[PDB]
Symmetry: D2
Subunit: 113 residues, 4 copies
């Protein structure tokens, strides 16, 4: 209740930070390049296809993850798709760290006892 407002402030701050913009700018670079927005969708589709089989515990023979990984290096091949993946991971692990930092105060309290 008291905290939320601080959270929305952080959400706004995040979304507005240069890093996140950079990321957005990169999504656009790819979305706007016929060539690149192809590869991306390809990876995306094989990725979602795997995730799904997994959510229902289905078998996934090596065939599959081999193609998966293939397509991914082909991905890290095209300039524009590369920075997107690069920036997306750095955004992905960075906000993951933000979240850890927020849990800090509570870990502090625990230490105390």
């Amino acid at each position: 209740e008291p905290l939320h407002a601080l959270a929305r402030q952080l959400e706004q701050a995040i979304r507005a930070s240069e890093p996140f913009q950079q990321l957005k700018r990169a999504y656009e670079d790819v979305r706007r390049d016929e060539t690149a927005y192809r590869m991306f969708a390809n990876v995306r589709d094989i990725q979602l296809r795997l995730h799904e089989k997994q959510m229902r515990g289905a078998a996934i023979l090596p065939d599959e993850i081999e193609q998966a990984q293939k397509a991914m290096a082909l991905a890290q091949q095209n300039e524009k798709l590369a920075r997107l993946m690069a920036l997306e991971q750095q955004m992905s692990i960075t906000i993951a760290e933000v979240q850890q930092i927020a849990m800090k105060p509570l870990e502090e309290l625990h230490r105390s006892f």
Copy 2:
């Protein structure tokens, strides 16, 4: 300094200085200075602290171990100081979980757009 990191340390300090944290901090202070509620508190910590590490080195844990714990927990709930704490303590933790969830929206929102194609 990475802007986000800084914003997050900022977030940390705000939470610390917030009122609910201090409510919590003071709640701990209580059950810590009440010889009665402190023993139970402690008792519950260790039983729960031992079961943990017994699960890590993976070792069978009979019923009693859990009923003992389940019971030792109940009596702690029967305490006043401990309850206040046990609650503030839990709410704080869901509030936070919620905060970190908001931190994930900008990226959650963008991830969604990746489904555009």
Copy 3:
């Protein structure tokens, strides 16, 4: 359809399912489910916790006017003998299988050990 680990997993599912300790849990479940009162509380705490989950997952405020009672709800539930036993046995199982999940990881973890 042929993956061995898959089939192996199906086997495990049935093994746990037919094991002696699972049948005990299920019987504890049956006790409560058949006895009106315990059943009642059981569903309250469920509904309660379900509501909270709903809220937090939706990102809404959760003043102690909720996490408070919910913590009570569990209280005079932790009491009902029938419902207590279920809760007890339930966790024994949660933990038991959790350990089982660990052992399965073993081989790949020993190999990751080498990898370094």
Copy 4:
């Protein structure tokens, strides 16, 4: 522990299995091939380091992430190491599936019984 016995049996089967054995094989062909084991050591350390930095909550500029993915990409180019990678992942996913199928009976009861 009642299901413990059962557990060890699953472990035995798991490591004894054809797929677990080929994962071993694949790891062997890289350990004994200069080019791939050089590459493998390298990417394994980049990934070891990144993970260290995140635990420690340290910042991680895009450099590392770019430079890192550059490598993971070079690695997918080496047949030997490409196989290791793919098998290590397939085994990883599959084990996780084994784990989840295990909770299946308890979660099922806790939901559907009443």
